[model samples]
Each structure stands twice: as C-alpha cells, then as structure tokens.
Target: IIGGEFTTIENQPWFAAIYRVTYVCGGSLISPCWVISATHCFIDYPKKEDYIVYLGRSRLNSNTQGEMKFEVENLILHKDYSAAHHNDIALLKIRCAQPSRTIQTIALPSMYNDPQFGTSCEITGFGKEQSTDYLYPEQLKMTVVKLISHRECQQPHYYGSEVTTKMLCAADPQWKTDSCQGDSGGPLVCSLQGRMTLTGIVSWGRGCALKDKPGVYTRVSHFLPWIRSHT
Candidate 1:
C-alpha cells in the first residue's frame, strides 16, 4: 500500500490480514468462511496449519474488541492459474463462526459484469509503504486508483503485450499511489450502484508506483464461476 493514506477498519470491513508464519498477503472476506485473494500469494503453498485470517482489525499486531481470527481449512487456487500467464486468484476456506458487526462480507460482481474503465477503485491493505520498507503498516492503508483498459495497459511502455486479458490494471498515473509488497492478494473494490463490489485481487506489477506502469490485478469478474464452484 505504498503512497496510501492511513484508513480505518470501519471504512474497509472486508479487508483481511492474511498471515502464514508472518504477515504475507491481503484478502477479502466474501462470506463468513470464504476469503478471496491472489493465487500467486501462495507460491510456497504453505500448509493450512501455517495460515491464519485476521478480520475486524486495522493494525496487524494489535487486538481490538471485535477482532476475529480464524484457522484456514483449505486453499483453492484456480486450475488454470499460472505464474507466467496470470489468473493469479485463489480462495481460502477458514473455520469461522457467523460474521459480527465489525466483520462482514463483500459483494462479488456477477460473472458477466465488469467495472467500467477509468472507474475509481479503492485498494486497502497493511502492505509496505515503500519498496525498501519491509515493515507493513500497523493501521490499514487505502488509496484510490483509476482502472486502465487492457489495451492501454499492454502498451510497450507499460506492460507491453505481456499483459493478458485475464488481468486488469489500475494506478494513479502521477505515481502518487500504488500497491506494493505485502499488498498482494488484497481487494480492489469499486462502488457499483452504491455498493462496494469486489472487482479485482491484487496480483502482480513491475514495480510499486512506477510511472507508466500500473499495478496488475486478477480480474475477479472473470473467475466468478471458479469461485462459486469452490466456495
């Protein structure tokens, strides 16, 4: 969440702090027990026992009154997912009770719908504030990024033809905001008809906030079927 401003948990209740051995990535709680994230975040494929889900908390290390934690029961990565070709999305089944006031679910878009290009979206995470800063934010950070068309994102100056259709790009062209290390697998939510819908999952990028190069995300709309089948 480099260049992001500090935000409160109330503003991004769906944001999850995904940890495996340590704070590794971010995710979105789509249901009481189901969480969505990027497949690439689990490259090591850590054991279920090694993972934990933290919700209703803004800070990673602090415990608040409504903070809830859960043990991961399973991790489901897309069958066609490839580190080289994208499709960097995954789901985590956690053992949890019903949602509380502070911990709620996010709405996923219909499979056939896609957020309009240039729509302003918010990405929230406790990720690093700088490339060199390995420490993650104590309080969640959020920033607004405008969606870029696949055509514009694939330009040679941007991601070139390597950018695939399965992915979408979002960034502040001025390079003032972007997702960085520890932000992967986070939620890219856009307000659709007044409801914040989970539209993208933080996936990959050339660098954090590099001008002309936007952060790439796994388009959630494209994986609705896959998510439903597993969840």
Candidate 2:
C-alpha cells in the first residue's frame, strides 16, 4: 500500500488529479472532467479554486512531464448530503480533457446489489499507509477492502450506532487494510459483468484498517439520482 505502481506517471496516468482543497487535502479524478470526492472536502466553495486535479501522476513526490493539474471550475455537492453526518460526496468540474481508457466511466450498481456479504473489492488510492501513519500528502495510494452487511455495519459503534441506508460498508479482514486520511474521493472498484464498476466513493470511516471494525463508504447505488442530476 505504501509504494505501488502509478507512483509517478507510471502507466495509464489518466484520472490522477491533485485537489488543492483548503491549503491541504487530496482527491481523485473519476471522469475526464468529473472529480468525485466528499462534500466536506469542499466546505468552503470559494476556496475551491485553490484545489486542483492532477492526472497522469505516477509518483507522489513530483509532477513529471505530461502530468497535468487543472483548476476546479465548479463543484456540485449532493443536495441531500447531511452536514452533521459527513455525507460529503461531491463532483468537481475540470477545465480540460483527460486521458480516456477502457476502465474509465464505471457503471453504478443497480437498485439491487450483486455481491454477497463477504465479497472483496479492489480499492486503490493515495491514502494513509496505515491508520497510525501520517497522511501521504502528494502520492497516489491504493489498497483493497471488502463489503459488509448493512445489519452488521449499522451496529452501535458506527455513527452513534446508526448506519443509514444512505451509506455503504466495507473491510479487508485479511490485512486489516482500509482507506485513510488522504484517500477521500477515491474510487472503490467492484468487478462485475467482466467490468469493474465504481460502486462507491471512499467517503469516511473511524480508522484506517481495523479487524472487526471495517471501513464504511458511500454506496453509489443509493445516490444514483443525486449523482445523475448533479452531472
């Protein structure tokens, strides 16, 4: 998780944008022009200009040749997002064209999900190497996490013991790996129908990687209406 490929313009460096959110913070480019992230990421809309999306970034330490960063033109926040509960999913409009690939433009899940309670997913991003480790400010980090049951995810410990149908849940039990501080807005890829879908965005959770306490996410299916209307 600490050092994976795409370190710096490695390969298919499209969709690698740096969100200069509030003097500090990182984000990912889900679409050529659409940058998906949490709503809290853009608490101050005026300051959003400070945030930039960096695509084709292979390494975190430096911005190599061909790697581009775009200034955010406008940010669209989910109208129904709750301020208190951290419903921070948002779409950022970029100014230029981004590299296109087969993996680009993932499909949202249907009203009914296909994965079972213990299905593993491929979640990649430049987040914290570990829960206790410091946030990786520049580099693109990624790791795997698994989806869990709503009944169990909504247990007493999560969100004051209230896991609304509005959110998603996941965990990597084997390595105890999960998203950390800098991974907000990253994509959680779900491989279905021979194509991986962006099932959810890396929203927020209590910690990085806990054994029984897996990380929670914003289920893309639940926000289909909001996501489409905003786009």
Candidate with maximal lDDT: 1
What TM-score goes with each of the models? 0.95, 0.82
Q: Residue-wise lDDT of candidate 2 within 77-188, one digit each (tens)?
A: 7676674245668877877654643124445677646477677776666666765676464555555667888887876664445566767788866635677666666677
Kindly provide the TM-score of model 2 when superposed on the true structure, using C-alpha atoms.
Answer: 0.82
Looking at model 1, report the run of 10 residues with the lowest lDDT sum: 77-86
Clashes of 2: 26
Instruction: Please write out the lDDT profile of model 1 over residues 1-231, one tens digit for every residue.
Output: 888689877888888888885788899999888989887787686467888888887887887678888998998877777763477888899887466676889999888577888899999888889988857778889999999999899889988977888788999968889998889999999988778899898888887988997998888888888888898
> Candidate 2: minimum summed lDDT over ten consecutive residues — where?
3-12
lDDT of each prediction vs. the true structure?
0.85, 0.62
Give the Å error, residue 104, model 2: 4.0
Q: Which residue segments of model 1 deviate by more than 4 Å?
A: none
